[PDB]
Design an enzyme around this catalytic site. Structure first.
Site: not given
Ligand SMILES: NC(=O)c1ccc[n+]([C@@H]2O[C@H](COP(=O)([O-])OP(=O)(O)OC[C@H]3O[C@@H](n4cnc5c(N)ncnc54)[C@H](OP(=O)(O)O)[C@@H]3O)[C@@H](O)[C@H]2O)c1
Ligand SMILES: N#Cc1c(-c2ccccc2)[nH]c2nc(N)[nH]c(=O)c12
Ligand SMILES: NC(=O)c1ccc[n+]([C@@H]2O[C@H](COP(=O)([O-])OP(=O)(O)OC[C@H]3O[C@@H](n4cnc5c(N)ncnc54)[C@H](OP(=O)(O)O)[C@@H]3O)[C@@H](O)[C@H]2O)c1
Ligand SMILES: NC(=O)c1ccc[n+]([C@@H]2O[C@H](COP(=O)([O-])OP(=O)(O)OC[C@H]3O[C@@H](n4cnc5c(N)ncnc54)[C@H](OP(=O)(O)O)[C@@H]3O)[C@@H](O)[C@H]2O)c1
Ligand SMILES: NC(=O)c1ccc[n+]([C@@H]2O[C@H](COP(=O)([O-])OP(=O)(O)OC[C@H]3O[C@@H](n4cnc5c(N)ncnc54)[C@H](OP(=O)(O)O)[C@@H]3O)[C@@H](O)[C@H]2O)c1
Ligand SMILES: N#Cc1c(-c2ccccc2)[nH]c2nc(N)[nH]c(=O)c12
Ligand SMILES: N#Cc1c(-c2ccccc2)[nH]c2nc(N)[nH]c(=O)c12
Ligand SMILES: N#Cc1c(-c2ccccc2)[nH]c2nc(N)[nH]c(=O)c12
Lengths: 248, 249, 248, 248
Positions: C13, C135, C141, C154, C156, C158
């Protein structure tokens, strides 16, 4: 066909650097100025020497008044008359001086500070949108919540500009026009500021104890107008070396 | 001697509630109005019947113009003429209507929306301080300034500018012992122009009770900020919005 | 010599797109993962096929525990072991699930607060102590002040990550280490999330009525690690298509 | 019947002043403490002399651990045992010390700083809500965005506490439970701080060049739990004399 940008207050300092950097990126530029006519025409000469038919000037006072809407329409018009298109608007021009709560009359101060920093940007945004990788970049202030003593009207204008950036991002998103800001902390210090006060500001900046170059500010503008920021709208990027993080 | 307060746009709705609650706490009041002369005079009558010579009205257009500084000076002058002092200024008057980016001219729109919401508060603050206990100023802000209504750019710009004034003025007037704070409603008394169906839509969005704030609930926050219980509070903006600003799209 | 980066949660992802984009820019990469061993090894294979000896994997659980500091020290160690340097840290890994106020709660706290806040802190500690263009970029978020219902822990975490970003930018500035954030709104939607709920979220985005690609998020990370962001520290760049500006 | 309040860390300083004002307002109080048993018992004695059996003490370590959920449950349990009801929760107890990035181990510092300032408030909020003019008041920090040098873990905890305030306000609204915060700038300065250093902080405060009395902080708490704040939820009131407005 090369894209075209309008940059307000582009004859000197940060506006000049933004104009130059946009030009180097491949844009044709409208160099707006108020009083700095020689500097403005000198810049146009330099840029046209580099690539023919890529720079023009447009003079206007951006103080608030009954004729400001027409003045802002003409600046945007100048981009269309010269280049046939207008892809980018950079609201950079700005009055900056103190207005204590307790020479120029208060109504003039209001017109200049709120006009340049907020009302003109709003009218230019209106004209830009109506005439249509389109984007607008507004030069904000990273220190707006920790304002300089006795600069209430300037600070009000910069707060208003944040509101415009957000309101305009929301309203113009359906038209594919992005609207963002760049917020310097201390960059090129004001010409009048004494050397001792300049040094005091430099010594407060965590990252390197110095001010941002105009080019470092322009780098953030270039990022926001580029394809690498195509999902970014309503965002204000601080370029302040951590200055706003520093407590009293 | 009782202290005195100026409340702008006080003839009706939230301004009226603020004026009443200030009066009930012991203040003498200047009821500023623009077009609502009958309402303002009626309110002053009601307050004076409770306590003689404790309320006066003051008419003024707060649209931006070259005479606005004079009009603002005169509103503060009126409080001194009636009561010999001015302890509290409440910036409540506000123009509110859409201004799309894509029979009022844009000059008029700028003048009314930026004038009432930002420039007048600034000029009234200037005049208030210039004339100077428990002194303070309360600005009526907007809890939703960062999640604005579609096509309300000039209104939103005005309310943002008002946050800047609140902070800038708090900083600068601290040495004179004048505190400057804000109260930021979400949905309170909905516009009279708004239809009942659309009012319900907004009510349904509010986490705390699925209803709008009463004018009195807004006034309660103003009273706290002017009181002795807020003596160390300056530059603060209290949301009174029932959680509305916390709700994502 | 090519610089090196650590990306946490890099198997899939958004993390994967960041690792890939850093590698294309010229970085050698440590691909951290927890459970996604096959995807992580596959990525390292692809990057190494492009440029030999430029990628390795590093497994670690980033749940809070008394050994979490040692696990985080070992991730930074792995970069030095492999490449003799560590220039960039991207804190991307994240646990994301609801925790209603009305798995044990100990576990939920350990996972949500550990991955989103404490592990970033400990990794930042180890990165700094082992120390150019250094860096750190934290995946934040954009909706942190308009939180999802029943996601208190969650949220808290972020919020804590914003605090770390600002605190570390201030403290690490004298060492030349910048610390910034990238804050998606909706990007790649959760695998568990149903299609009707995905469409609901897409329809809320002003800019295009669609989620960001993982590549669009990576683009902001790349900007922040580059020479174009040399005066930028303590800044969080929203990449949300205007979503955070939309009222209920 | 009179309402009942739990105040954490209520033996001394700000927590004590909050308990006293709540009691003077008509509340029965649970005085929570960790080490300060003499002070807690003496405070309860004083309040019970005013009105019979209107105060009780409750000891608990609020450091993060496997037993913390149980411990927080027992604090709320202790209010119901003593008074048959629990109307108000004030999260005031807090660890506060530096944790530089470059004899306590880091895992212990994490446990104490994130536990007291964020995780315990979360668990107490859960237990409070599960057991039901109801409200929660969290003691925050006005300077959270201009943080003390080398206080990253403290700052992360206080940011997390803003997250909880907002998330819980949203989630608990349907139950009629309001959740707000009070944010001091400088109030009672730490006992360990030298008087020269205290004087430097006092000189920074715009409004009166002094710190807030504990009673001034208590005044904002009383407002938030009163009927004059019935529509207020998710709001954090700074009580800082303008300190957060002062640039470096
Ligand atoms: N996706 C969105 O729309 C969105 C929105 C807002 C913020 N974000 C932020 O952007 C970043 C990437 O998002 P994403 O959706 O790609 O994330 P995600 O798929 O939910 O998580 C990314 C990776 O985090 C790892 N992870 C989960 N628990 C873990 C643990 N206990 N120890 C070590 N690693 C762990 C997992 O690795 P493994 O698969 O190897 O287990 C997972 O593949 C995150 O910080 C997320 O909060 C995303
Ligand atoms: N959608 C979404 C996610 C969001 C999110 C998306 C919209 C509003 C608030 C949070 N945060 C996430 N964090 C991780 N690790 N993986 C996610 O898919 C998301
Ligand atoms: N410099 C900093 O450290 C700093 C810090 C924070 C924010 N900013 C923002 O970044 C932007 C650029 O800063 P800067 O220092 O380069 O600005 P600046 O030199 O103070 O002003 C830029 C230009 O604004 C134009 N201008 C002034 N009054 C005008 C008016 N009434 N009508 C039309 N144009 C007018 C002037 O044009 P003429 O010379 O042709 O008359 C001037 O050259 C500004 O928006 C500023 O607020 C800068
Ligand atoms: N109502 C809400 O849900 C809500 C939400 C967020 C913020 N607020 C803020 O709270 C405050 C009070 O709200 P409200 O709904 O009670 O306000 P409102 O009824 O819309 O306006 C209050 C008064 O402002 C005065 N006014 C308008 N234009 C003026 C002008 N050009 N010059 C002088 N006065 C002028 C009017 O006085 P006359 O009638 O005498 O002409 C009017 O009665 C406002 O600042 C508003 O922005 C309200
Ligand atoms: N004082 C200020 O200038 C200031 C500024 C900003 C924010 N605040 C916030 O306002 C609140 C009150 O401030 P304050 O200075 O009065 O607080 P404080 O004296 O530093 O701490 C209050 C109490 O917290 C309790 N505590 C510490 N560690 C604990 C643990 N592991 N488990 C359970 N309890 C623990 C202690 O109880 P025992 O004594 O019984 O051991 C202590 O008396 C705090 O949340 C603080 O962060 C204060
Ligand atoms: N220094 C400075 C400036 C600042 C400024 C610098 C430090 C803190 C807050 C503002 N703003 C300016 N705006 C214009 N137009 N020109 C300037 O030089 C500045
Ligand atoms: N509803 C509403 C209003 C709002 C408002 C309501 C909901 C979201 C944002 C703003 N602002 C107002 N200002 C004035 N002067 N008068 C009003 O009625 C309102
Ligand atoms: N001074 C101070 C404190 C501050 C503080 C004061 C000024 C700026 C930032 C933080 N926070 C505190 N938290 C606790 N628990 N105890 C304290 O004494 C303080």
């Amino acid at each position: 066909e090369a894209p075209a940008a309008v940059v307000t207050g582009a004859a000197k300092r940060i506006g000049r650097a933004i104009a130059v950097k946009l030009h180097q990126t491949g844009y044709r530029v409208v160099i707006h100025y108020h009083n700095s006519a020689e500097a403005a025409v000198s810049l146009a000469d330099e840029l046209n020497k580099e690539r023919s038919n890529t720079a023009v000037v447009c003079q206007a006072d951006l103080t608030n008044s009954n004729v400001l809407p027409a003045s802002c329409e003409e600046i945007i018009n100048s981009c269309f008359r010269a280049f046939g298109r207008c892809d980018v608007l950079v609201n950079n021009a700005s009055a900056f001086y103190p207005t204590p709560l307790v020479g120029k009359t208060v109504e003039t101060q209001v017109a200049e500070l709120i006009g340049t920093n907020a009302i003109a940007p709003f009218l230019l945004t209106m004209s830009f949108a109506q005439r249509q990788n389109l984007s607008i970049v507004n030069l904000c202030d990273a220190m707006v919540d920790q304002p300089c003593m006795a600069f209430s009207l300037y600070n009000m204008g910069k707060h208003a500009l944040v509101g415009l950036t957000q309101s305009a991002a929301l309203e113009l998103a359906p038209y594919g026009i992005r609207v963002n800001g760049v917020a310097p902390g201390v960059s090129l210090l004001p010409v009048a500021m004494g050397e001792e006060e300049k040094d005091k500001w430099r010594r407060k900046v965590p990252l390197g104890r110095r001010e941002a170059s105009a080019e470092q500010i322009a780098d953030a503008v270039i990022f926001l107008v580029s394809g690498s920021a195509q999902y970014i709208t309503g965002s204000i990027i601080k370029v302040d070396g951590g200055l706003s993080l520093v407590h009293a």
